Design a protein around this motif. Structure first.
Motif, mmCIF file in Angstrom:
data_model
loop_
_atom_site.group_PDB
_atom_site.id
_atom_site.type_symbol
_atom_site.label_atom_id
_atom_site.label_comp_id
_atom_site.label_asym_id
_atom_site.label_seq_id
_atom_site.Cartn_x
_atom_site.Cartn_y
_atom_site.Cartn_z
ATOM 1 N N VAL A 280 -6.641 -2.328 -3.608
ATOM 2 C CA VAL A 280 -5.357 -2.431 -4.301
ATOM 3 C C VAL A 280 -5.508 -3.190 -5.618
ATOM 4 O O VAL A 280 -4.953 -2.783 -6.648
ATOM 5 N N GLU A 281 -6.299 -4.270 -5.618
ATOM 6 C CA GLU A 281 -6.530 -5.026 -6.851
ATOM 7 C C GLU A 281 -7.274 -4.207 -7.899
ATOM 8 O O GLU A 281 -6.958 -4.297 -9.090
ATOM 9 N N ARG B 51 -3.878 -14.224 -2.946
ATOM 10 C CA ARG B 51 -4.133 -12.935 -3.584
ATOM 11 C C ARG B 51 -2.983 -11.957 -3.363
ATOM 12 O O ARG B 51 -2.554 -11.272 -4.303
ATOM 13 N N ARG C 23 -8.864 -3.439 2.032
ATOM 14 C CA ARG C 23 -7.550 -2.978 1.577
ATOM 15 C C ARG C 23 -7.083 -3.744 0.345
ATOM 16 O O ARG C 23 -6.663 -3.141 -0.657
ATOM 17 N N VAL C 24 -7.167 -5.079 0.401
ATOM 18 C CA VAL C 24 -6.683 -5.880 -0.719
ATOM 19 C C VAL C 24 -7.537 -5.678 -1.969
ATOM 20 O O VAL C 24 -6.995 -5.583 -3.078
ATOM 21 N N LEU C 25 -8.862 -5.536 -1.827
ATOM 22 C CA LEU C 25 -9.672 -5.367 -3.035
ATOM 23 C C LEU C 25 -9.512 -3.976 -3.641
ATOM 24 O O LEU C 25 -9.578 -3.837 -4.870
ATOM 25 N N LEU D 151 2.530 1.695 -3.500
ATOM 26 C CA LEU D 151 1.577 2.084 -4.533
ATOM 27 C C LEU D 151 1.073 3.507 -4.327
ATOM 28 O O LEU D 151 0.871 4.233 -5.306
ATOM 29 N N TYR E 71 3.263 -9.620 -9.299
ATOM 30 C CA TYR E 71 3.086 -8.674 -10.397
ATOM 31 C C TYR E 71 3.766 -7.339 -10.108
ATOM 32 O O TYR E 71 4.339 -6.724 -11.015
ATOM 33 N N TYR F 232 -7.266 -0.827 -8.259
ATOM 34 C CA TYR F 232 -6.384 0.196 -8.816
ATOM 35 C C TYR F 232 -5.307 -0.419 -9.706
ATOM 36 O O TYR F 232 -4.959 0.147 -10.754
ATOM 37 N N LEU F 233 -4.794 -1.594 -9.333
ATOM 38 C CA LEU F 233 -3.784 -2.230 -10.169
ATOM 39 C C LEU F 233 -4.377 -2.786 -11.455
ATOM 40 O O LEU F 233 -3.689 -2.811 -12.479
ATOM 41 N N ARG F 234 -5.644 -3.214 -11.437
ATOM 42 C CA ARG F 234 -6.307 -3.617 -12.675
ATOM 43 C C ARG F 234 -6.472 -2.440 -13.621
ATOM 44 O O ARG F 234 -6.276 -2.580 -14.835
ATOM 45 N N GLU G 23 0.818 -1.211 0.000
ATOM 46 C CA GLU G 23 0.000 0.000 0.000
ATOM 47 C C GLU G 23 0.852 1.262 0.000
ATOM 48 O O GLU G 23 0.539 2.222 -0.714
ATOM 49 N N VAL H 217 -0.507 -10.358 -6.282
ATOM 50 C CA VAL H 217 -0.344 -8.920 -6.484
ATOM 51 C C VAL H 217 1.106 -8.504 -6.255
ATOM 52 O O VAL H 217 1.656 -7.691 -7.007
ATOM 53 N N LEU I 164 -3.361 -10.784 -13.533
ATOM 54 C CA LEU I 164 -4.159 -10.284 -12.420
ATOM 55 C C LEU I 164 -5.478 -11.017 -12.243
ATOM 56 O O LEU I 164 -5.853 -11.331 -11.113
#
Ligand SMILES: *[C@@H]1O[C@H](CO)[C@@H](O[C@@H]2O[C@H](CO)[C@@H](O[C@@H]3O[C@H](CO[C@H]4O[C@H](CO)[C@@H](O)[C@H](O)[C@@H]4O)[C@@H](O)[C@H](O[C@H]4O[C@H](CO)[C@@H](O)[C@H](O)[C@@H]4O)[C@@H]3O)[C@H](O)[C@H]2NC(C)=O)[C@H](O)[C@H]1NC(C)=O
Ligand SMILES: *[C@@H]1O[C@H](CO)[C@@H](O[C@@H]2O[C@H](CO)[C@@H](O)[C@H](O)[C@H]2NC(C)=O)[C@H](O)[C@H]1NC(C)=O
Ligand SMILES: *[C@@H]1O[C@H](CO)[C@@H](O[C@@H]2O[C@H](CO)[C@@H](O)[C@H](O)[C@H]2NC(C)=O)[C@H](O)[C@H]1NC(C)=O
Ligand SMILES: *[C@@H]1O[C@H](CO)[C@@H](O[C@@H]2O[C@H](CO)[C@@H](O)[C@H](O)[C@H]2NC(C)=O)[C@H](O)[C@H]1NC(C)=O
Ligand SMILES: *[C@@H]1O[C@H](CO)[C@@H](O)[C@H](O)[C@H]1NC(C)=O
Ligand SMILES: *[C@@H]1O[C@H](CO)[C@@H](O)[C@H](O)[C@H]1NC(C)=O
Ligand SMILES: *[C@@H]1O[C@H](CO)[C@@H](O)[C@H](O)[C@H]1NC(C)=O
Ligand SMILES: *[C@@H]1O[C@H](CO)[C@@H](O)[C@H](O)[C@H]1NC(C)=O
Ligand SMILES: *[C@@H]1O[C@H](CO)[C@@H](O)[C@H](O)[C@H]1NC(C)=O
Ligand SMILES: *[C@@H]1O[C@H](CO)[C@@H](O)[C@H](O)[C@H]1NC(C)=O
Ligand SMILES: *[C@@H]1O[C@H](CO)[C@@H](O)[C@H](O)[C@H]1NC(C)=O
Ligand SMILES: *[C@@H]1O[C@H](CO)[C@@H](O)[C@H](O)[C@H]1NC(C)=O
Ligand SMILES: *[C@@H]1O[C@H](CO)[C@@H](O)[C@H](O)[C@H]1NC(C)=O
Ligand SMILES: *[C@@H]1O[C@H](CO)[C@@H](O)[C@H](O)[C@H]1NC(C)=O
Lengths: 123, 460, 123, 123, 52, 52
Positions: free
Chosen positions: C42-43, D38, C38-40, A46, D45, C45-47, A43, D42, D26
């Motif tokens: 980040v996923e 997960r 938090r993890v979703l 990023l 990547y 924004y990275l997508r 986090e 991430v 992803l």
């Protein structure tokens, strides 16, 4: 040389050693703490890269912009700033106005890129 | 002539912050097939090269009585203790009235026999079993002078959980590491009184090895000091704050025991078997601890000659601990899985009046201090939230050729017109051990983004 | 301006509030929901950054490409579509017609990269 | 084409299919296992994208550098590589000599970085 | 009166009602009358917008 | 006291901290907590309502 190699040196000497400081950013009961620490490290990296990428300075250690510097933030000349202070105190009297600095940089980037789009669509 | 904003990535600035921390063990504990009460597999292995960097001309404020790493270590050890007793035998059927006599012929004056009855593989039938229980584990429930009835001591408060007899309580070292984007400031000044500025601050990712030993008084294995005996305290004005003495040289200490037979396996249910103490073969002697005389005498004299800086015109004395139950006033530790509680009247019997008394006798090394001391089995540490452990006994004789590092003193409430301020030993909360190991470190957050005005301007 | 400060404005007004809307894509029963959130985030924004970096437009708020616009997607002029309707109606019109646009962008980017590779290998 | 659509095909078809194989990098007790999978996905990547970002090839699928190719790594003809091989045995051939390649690329980008650094302040 | 503490098992404590001191009285809840009546009438006049 | 009318006395025996021995205790449970065990016509073998 690794982290914080000129953490108490003068401001002007810090500009010649920036290539070695921003390197290490990714490299039961003791599994959950490790997972939380890993997630907050991802986090943090990023967030820093995204905030560097909004105002047109992606992939650059030193980036120059086109917003004028108001005198109501520091009111001190360039010579004593770049040869007298360490970074710690300078961060202390900029931390009251870093939000205004960030907003002005973001709006300047958006105006510049819209001007670039209009210039490219002129042809 | 004009000024423009320029961003910088790599600006070295700090913020005081708290964060969750790692565990970094070594590879040598990774190969053992037994799992101790701490972790070996869960911790990430560390690199065999500690990257240490020294800062140029910085001076940083430090504190250790208001720290976060101490509380995180305390929560980690409490959670590990409460987690390593989940798949273990719960001795809730060991609450029966116990009929106890003298320990056979020629009474041992330490143990009672305490034969009870227990439940066999059928819920209906019962069978008679016998064991050997230590005296502090046994309490005479009574309404009269009936001395033939007794009960176990933890069938009154809570818990009754037996430790799993394949784990070890050995203190392997664990390192603390900050996550990426953080750092640890470590102060290398030798005369660090505990709080205030430091001028040799170094930035470290992973701290040095910490042995999580448990001791009330008289700190065991640990990191030594650097130059001299060092006093650490919060105020040195009130007497309620525990004063920590850190030594420069170690003093050897050994603690031994006579024999026991073996674990006597007693079955109390389906697949539930606890191991009480069986017979005792050989004669009966007293468990004890041994310390060299002259090493302890001149170590306490060095603490005397250095301790007089804060009390210049007064003599200092020592006496025993200031009363209470046996679990607090006594030097308590563990060796080989057996918990020792020891009386320390013979160590703190002396005074200093300002006259240094040197000793030169190489043939007087035979004199030793002994400590006549006892063994419990039912453990109630952390003064609560403990999940009261029954440590199973160990068959052979045990030897604990240890090392000593620090002392946990306190000051008695002084009187008027006094020049004889006394210092007692005290235990208390277990934060003092890891506070006496983590005095050096402070966790900190780096902020690698900065803004500055300069003459450079971006092209349009 | 806030997080959705121009949701009913026109195209020419909502194209200036991009930089104060993209800034906020990253910033026990109730101690695991926070971690999943938090993890979703980040996923997600990275997508988005994955989808932007594929057609060669990393770190750009407004992106000019070289894919011709098929008239069957809109059948409309430019002045009224940039000064009349908001982003929501135009997104609702084009929401059936997105995957072929993304494929066209991917094909045109790889063709442009092979052409630039050939031109730089010619020298 | 689809995922792994040209894994056995020659080098010519392999450059036309890079843009689709970057799509799929992803896209209780089992809950912590799912979060572990997960977070490792991430993080893998993100390390890959950072590694592309160190030696100046961020965002671009095909990136040209200025590191001279020493002949002892391959000792093979150019048209032999690009018209008679698939990627797999090429990877088995080069995989012993990867760290020298990575270090040379990193130092070449460091050289170009200090060239940009002392070119920015010399006009 | 009190939480009388019965002890059950190896360390379980169960809290029950002990004695009662004083007399026995009923447990009531009090609502104001006219506030309830005109609030109920306001619900009535707002409920005739749907039913004619 | 002979005039409560909403709470019964409900004395029982229970397991003490020693599981061999039992002791005689009492409480005051509320009336809807309690149902009669209808093994006879005696209105004195009451039980707790959650026991089935
Ligand atoms: C402070 O620091 C000291 C110094 O290390 C620590 O003292 C050590 O304590 C541990 C236990 O806590 C001791 O380990 C035990 O040693 C016993 C004797 O070992 C001798 O014999 C064996 C062969 O039987 C030889 O291989 C060895 O080299 C010695 O010659 C063993 O009998 C013990 O084994 C038991 O545990 C293992 C593991 O579960 C079982 O498999 C066995 O069956 C058996 O039950 C054990 O290994 C160690 O010897 C001590 N060191 C020294 C130098 O004596 C202190 O513990 C530490 N902390 C405190 C609070 O003081
Ligand atoms: C504790 O008491 C038990 C019995 O209550 C003793 O066990 C007895 O030992 C004698 C040995 O002379 C046997 O003859 C008996 O059959 C045993 N009785 C049993 C097993 O129920 C035991 O010896 C006592 N403990 C000690 C240390 O003497
Ligand atoms: C059950 O535990 C309580 C403590 O919670 C015991 O109460 C005291 O225990 C100490 C330690 O032996 C005695 O010195 C005191 O005399 C006890 N009483 C008081 C009023 O402090 C209690 O004794 C335990 N039960 C039994 C049967 O021993
Ligand atoms: C468990 O016990 C309760 C208490 O008696 C039962 O509830 C009663 O069931 C009868 C028979 O159906 C009804 O006439 C009563 O009205 C119920 N309530 C009371 C307060 O008596 C219940 O049926 C039992 N069995 C279950 C839950 O399976
Ligand atoms: C002390 O700080 C100054 C900063 O002006 C630095 O130049 C100097 O090297 C520092 N001293 C040492 C011994 O590093
Ligand atoms: C224990 O159980 C046995 C089972 O036969 C019984 O005879 C005995 O009275 C019980 N109590 C004691 C104190 O031994
Ligand atoms: C600071 O600590 C390092 C640790 O090795 C030591 O070498 C150095 O001499 C110390 N400097 C001072 C001024 O104490
Ligand atoms: C503790 O220290 C502070 C300052 O260090 C002092 O003001 C205070 O009086 C001390 N406490 C006592 C009880 O003297
Ligand atoms: C230690 O404490 C005891 C407790 O009463 C006291 O009598 C004695 O004077 C103290 N000092 C010494 C040196 O024993
Ligand atoms: C310790 O020893 C002294 C004298 O040897 C004795 O008076 C005292 O009762 C013992 N026990 C404790 C707990 O101090
Ligand atoms: C302390 O030491 C003195 C002399 O060394 C001795 O007479 C005395 O018995 C010891 N113990 C106590 C409790 O004073
Ligand atoms: C006790 O154990 C130690 C372990 O080193 C051994 O040296 C000693 O001989 C043992 N004691 C006896 C009486 O065997
Ligand atoms: C304790 O002191 C002895 C004596 O020098 C030493 O050999 C031993 O290593 C020390 N203990 C530890 C744990 O370092
Ligand atoms: C409860 O236990 C006591 C003593 O164990 C016994 O006298 C009594 O009959 C039992 N039953 C009732 C209903 O009180």
């Amino acid at each position: 040389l690794g982290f914080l190699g000129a953490a108490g040196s003068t401001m002007g000497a810090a500009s010649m050693t920036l290539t070695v400081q921003a390197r290490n950013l990714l490299s039961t009961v003791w599994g959950i703490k490790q997972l939380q620490a890993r997630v907050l490290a991802v986090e943090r990296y990023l967030r820093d890269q995204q905030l560097l990428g909004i105002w047109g300075c992606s992939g650059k250690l030193i980036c120059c912009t086109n917003v004028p510097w108001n005198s109501s933030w520091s009111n001190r000349n360039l010579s004593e700033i770049w040869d007298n202070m360490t970074w710690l105190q300078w961060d202390k009297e900029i931390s009251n106005y870093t939000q205004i600095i960030y907003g002005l940089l973001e709006e300047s980037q958006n105006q510049q890129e819209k001007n670039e789009q209009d210039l490219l669509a002129l042809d | 002539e004009n000024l423009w904003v320029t961003v910088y990535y790599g600006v070295p600035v700090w913020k005081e912050a708290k964060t969750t921390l790692f565990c970094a063990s070594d590879a040598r504990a990774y190969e053992k097939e037994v799992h101790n009460v701490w972790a070996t597999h869960a911790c990430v292995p560390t690199d065999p090269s500690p990257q240490e960097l020294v800062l140029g001309n910085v001076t940083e404020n430090f504190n250790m009585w208001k720290n976060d790493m101490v509380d995180q270590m305390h929560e980690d050890i409490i959670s590990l203790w409460d987690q390593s007793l989940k798949p273990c035998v719960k001795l809730t059927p060991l609450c029966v009235t116990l009929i106890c006599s003298d320990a056979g012929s020629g009474g041992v004056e330490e143990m009672k026999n305490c034969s009870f009855n227990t439940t066999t593989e059928i819920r209906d039938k019962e069978k008679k079993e016998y064991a050997l229980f230590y005296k502090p584990d046994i309490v005479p429930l009574s309404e009269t002078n009936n001395t033939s009835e007794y009960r176990l001591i933890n069938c009154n408060t809570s818990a009754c959980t037996q430790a799993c007899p394949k784990v070890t309580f050995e203190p392997i070292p664990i390192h603390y590491c900050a996550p990426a984007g953080y750092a640890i400031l470590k102060c290398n000044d030798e005369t660090f009184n505990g709080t205030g500025p430091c001028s040799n601050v170094s930035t470290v990712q992973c701290t040095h090895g910490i042995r999580p030993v448990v001791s009330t008084q008289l700190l065991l294995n640990g990191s030594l000091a650097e130059k001299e005996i060092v006093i650490r305290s919060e105020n040195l004005t009130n007497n309620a704050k525990i004063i920590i003495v850190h030594l420069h040289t170690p003093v050897e200490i050994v603690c031994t025991r006579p024999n026991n037979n073996t674990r006597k396996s007693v079955r109390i249910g389906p697949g539930q078997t606890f191991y009480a103490t069986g017979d005792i073969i050989g004669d009966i002697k007293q468990a004890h601890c041994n310390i060299s005389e002259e090493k302890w005498n001149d170590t306490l004299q060095k603490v005397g000659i250095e301790l007089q800086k804060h009390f210049p015109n007064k003599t200092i004395k020592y006496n025993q601990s200031a009363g209470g139950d046996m679990e607090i006033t006594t030097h308590s530790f563990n060796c080989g899985g057996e918990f020792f509680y020891c009386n320390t009247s013979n160590l703190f019997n002396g005074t200093y009046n300002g006259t240094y008394i040197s000793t030169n006798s190489s043939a007087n090394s035979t004199s030793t201090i002994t400590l006549q001391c006892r063994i419990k089995q039912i453990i109630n540490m952390w003064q609560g939230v403990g999940r009261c452990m029954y440590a199973p006994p160990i068959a052979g004789n045990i030897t604990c050729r240890s090392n000593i590092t620090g002392l946990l003193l306190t000051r008695d409430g002084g009187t008027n017109s006094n020049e004889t301020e006394t210092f007692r030993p005290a235990g208390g909360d277990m934060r003092d051990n890891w506070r006496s190991e983590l005095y050096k470190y402070k966790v900190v957050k780096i902020e690698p983004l900065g803004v500055a005005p300069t003459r450079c301007k971006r092209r349009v």
